[PDB]
Design a protein around this ligand. Structure first.
Ligand SMILES: CCS(=O)(=O)CCN(C)C(=O)N(C)C
Ligand SMILES: [Mg+2]
Lengths: 151, 151
């Protein structure tokens, strides 16, 4: 594989390790991966990081009751661009009524970009993905990894 | 002030704000600022970040019981180069005997580099600085700022 392909694989491994850790501990998380539609307007609302990705940093960001935990992390390729970012809230009626603001923000950004957003529920530990206006819930670890590899 | 001067002042303010937060909560912390002596060999022992400095990120790094809290943050060229880095433990017999490995690590790196290290005690929330093999204990906010500005 090329260096670009290896870097992508390392980033997917970092993300999946972090998401799996947070799901097990019921740490709420909201992680948007920018694709071809630029997300600068939303990146600029958060705290700039421009940091190399690691599972450790992703986990540390979302620890409850910390400066960076509220709002979205936005990733650009192999970097964490910013944390605590604003995302628009979807009004879609196909968001389960029990779900809170993290899921509505994820669907919201997915309606105006081609990004892929991962959500960990602090209530259940369930993992979901928002893409193209649709929310897919209760993902297995294998399903999440496959979705990321396909992205 | 010039852009470089404004950037240095912003970094000092981010550091002091994070140190004050951690001192209040008695969160142990270890933050080494590289100077003329290169510290690449120690940076390489940690988790790479190469992140923009913010008080928020510094606080999120040092939260107890998290991946990144165990070890030193090393700053270089106005960025957080890495977290959870190893520093050498001083064998000096002239460190206050009630202090533990965090402070001995800070003195240790200060014995072999011209770096400035900030330590927050998890026992007391006291703030200290290691430079040139010596530990300056129980610093006020004004004292720490003066040291950073002098450095
Ligand atoms: C974190 C990513 S990891 O795969 O390195 C294991 C996570 N760690 C190290 C951790 O949770 N603590 C509390 C130290
Ligand atoms: Mg299902």
């Amino acid at each position: 594989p090329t260096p670009v392909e290896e870097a992508q694989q390392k980033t997917i491994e970092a993300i999946t390790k972090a998401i799996n850790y947070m799901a097990k501990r019921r740490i709420g998380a909201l992680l948007t991966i920018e694709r071809d539609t630029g997300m600068g307007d939303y990146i600029e609302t958060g705290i700039p990081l421009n940091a190399k990705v690691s599972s450790e940093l992703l986990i540390n960001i979302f620890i409850p009751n910390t400066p960076l935990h509220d709002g979205a992390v936005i990733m650009k390729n192999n970097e964490i661009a910013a944390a605590a970012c604003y995302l628009p809230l979807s009004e879609s009626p196909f968001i389960s009524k029990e779900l809170g603001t993290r899921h509505r923000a994820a669907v919201g950004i997915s309606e105006v970009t081609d990004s892929l957003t991962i959500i960990v529920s602090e209530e259940t530990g369930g993992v979901s993905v928002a893409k193209n206006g649709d929310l897919h819930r209760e993902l297995t670890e294998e399903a999440l990894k496959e979705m990321l590899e396909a992205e």
